Amino acid sequence: TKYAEGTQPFTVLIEGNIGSGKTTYLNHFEKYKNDICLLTEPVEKWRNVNGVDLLELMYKDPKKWAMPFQSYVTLTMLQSHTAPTNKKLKIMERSIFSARYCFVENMRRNGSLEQGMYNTLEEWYKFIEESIHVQADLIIYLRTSPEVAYERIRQRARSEESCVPLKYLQELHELHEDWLIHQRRPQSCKVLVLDADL
Amino acid sequence: TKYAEGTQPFTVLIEGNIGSGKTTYLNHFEKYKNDICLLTEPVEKWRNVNGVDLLELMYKDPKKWAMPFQSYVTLTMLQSHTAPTNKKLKIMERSIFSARYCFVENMRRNGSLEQGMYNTLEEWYKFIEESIHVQADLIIYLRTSPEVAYERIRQRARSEESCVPLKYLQELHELHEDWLIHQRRPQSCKVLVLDAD
Ligand SMILES: Cc1cn([C@H]2C[C@H](O)[C@@H](COP(=O)(O)OP(=O)(O)OP(=O)(O)O)O2)c(=O)[nH]c1=O
Ligand SMILES: Cc1cn([C@H]2C[C@H](O)[C@@H](COP(=O)(O)OP(=O)(O)OP(=O)(O)O)O2)c(=O)[nH]c1=O
């Protein structure tokens, strides 16, 4: 019996590249706040952990900070996935799945995570599968081109994200495609693909 | 309802400094293998994670490797704390508690863990308290002097541990004392103190 088993309503995950518009999309559900559990914009936690900007440290020094940063991302997603609610619908920006299948995998490929750091994260993910219930009924994939994602990141202008290259976004895009369209990863709930290029 | 709740027998944790003799002590229960769940020498996992020696990397480059290493320690302890068994007694070398109250705290104090790494580990520990059941009925504290612990480490001669100073062992000793004798940490099951000198 997994933690949070049987405590969760129908759950929708909003996924897509950085700057694909997940938060914007989720904001359209604001008026229904009282009948839907809405968990949006988790990046605000990652930018301020008792005053420490983990997001910033990760971009400035990935070889030292990518592992604790992804570890913290995993934790916050788990807290969101398992948060109690009386509401009959839950919608979340991101999930433990994109952290694992897109970001951790890309950080392994680009050398930010050494093999031993990657293995530690993967062993944690395997333990989480066995011990924590993660309700996932539908994924909405906000599909964009990396060039469009790049412009949205620029417009928003998070200081932490000011050095993020288009190449990084191309890499992440292919990983989201692998996972959400080509089903290359053992994640099999339903996926609705939306054209988020507008 | 926490994961592993109601699946665990009476559980004993063996604690003490590096080289205090926890494994040696636990080895005396070998003949009762069939009536006791014995989980010993977890360091063997930390020295070989699909071929990677995390213990070694941590000692050689703590500022980069202390966080993933402590994260992996936490995970292996959790897997041991929650492992299923039909046996009526479980005895474990170490626990998630010593990882947290002695090693992580000492790594914070000596600068191996930056504040943000320490905060990440602590936030994980707080989530684990809320979500995972950790059976702990008795702790046996193998109390030693740091000089005696130092001798045993040198005798065993793990290559990873060849640069470990006596000062480090003095620091860890005080943390084990704080936790297991002076009750400075919010951990309150029963403690039996043994003279392991
Ligand atoms: C999920 C995740 C995000 N990040 C980073 C990428 C981003 O810089 C930041 C947040 O990314 P996103 O999770 O993509 O959030 P966002 O609000 O930027 O998305 P949108 O514009 O579509 O609303 O966190 C990681 O480094 N690792 C991860 O595991
Ligand atoms: C538990 C723990 C150990 N370590 C290190 C310390 C040691 O080098 C190594 C193992 O130490 P111990 O966990 O004390 O195991 P041991 O086998 O050395 O103990 P004994 O001789 O009493 O049987 O791992 C950490 O760095 N962090 C931790 O959280």
* Strands, sheet with A10-16, edge to edge from the N-terminal-most edge strand: A36-39, A89-93, A10-16, A138-143, A190-195
> Of all atoms in ligand 1, which is nearest to the CA of residue A164?
8
- Residue A39's alpha-carbon distances to A54, A84, A91, in angstroms, are 20, 12, 6
Provide the residue type at B112 as one letter: S
Structure tokens at B71: 């994260």
PDB experimental method: X-ray
Give helix then strand counts, H and E, for chain A. 9, 5
Q: What phi, psi does B136 have (nearest 5°)?
A: -145, 105
Which residue in chain B has the smallest CA separation from A6? B1
Distance from C-alpha of B166 to C-alpha of B149, rounded to nearest angstrom: 9
Distance from C-alpha of B117 to C-alpha of B102, rounded to nearest angstrom: 16
Contacts 24+ apart (CB under 8 A), B61-69: B62/B107, B62/B112, B63/A64, B63/B111, B63/B112, B63/B114, B64/A63, B64/A64, B65/A116, B66/B107, B66/B112, B66/B113, B66/B117, B67/A67, B67/A68, B67/A71, B67/B113, B67/B117, B67/B120, B67/B121, B68/A67, B68/A116, B68/A117, B68/A120
| Cβ neighbours of B131 in A, within 8 Å | 3-4, 82, 131-132
Q: Are the beta carbons of A121 and A108 closer than 8 angstroms?
A: no
Distance from C-alpha of B56 to C-alpha of A118, rounded to nearest angstrom: 17
Q: Are the beta carbons of A173 and A164 closer than 8 angstroms?
A: no
Q: Is A171 annotated as a binding residue?
A: no
- Determine which one of A93, A123, A160, A177 is catalytic: A93
For residues B97, B100, B106, B109, the Cα torsion angle rounded to the nearest 10 degrees is -140
- Residue A16's alpha-carbon distances to A7, A59, A136, A137, in angstroms, are 27, 20, 16, 17
> Of all atoms in ligand 1, which is nearest to the CA of residue A161?
8
* Strands, sheet with B138-143, edge to edge from the N-terminal-most edge strand: B36-39, B89-93, B10-16, B138-143, B190-195
Any idea what the Cα angle at residue B104 is, between residues B26 and B36, rounded to 5°? Answer: 20
Q: Are the beta carbons of B173 and B149 closer than 8 angstroms?
A: yes
All domains in chain B, ordered by first residue: 1-197 (3.40.50.300)
Distance from C-alpha of B103 to C-alpha of B107, rounded to nearest angstrom: 6
Torsion over CA: A47, A117, B171, B137 (sign): positive
Structure tokens at B8: 């665990």
Contact residues of B toward A, CB < 8 A: 1-5, 49-50, 52, 54, 57, 63-65, 67-68, 71-72, 75, 78-79, 82, 115-117, 119-120, 123-124, 127, 131-132
Cα-to-centroid distance, B145 and ligand 2 (Å): 16
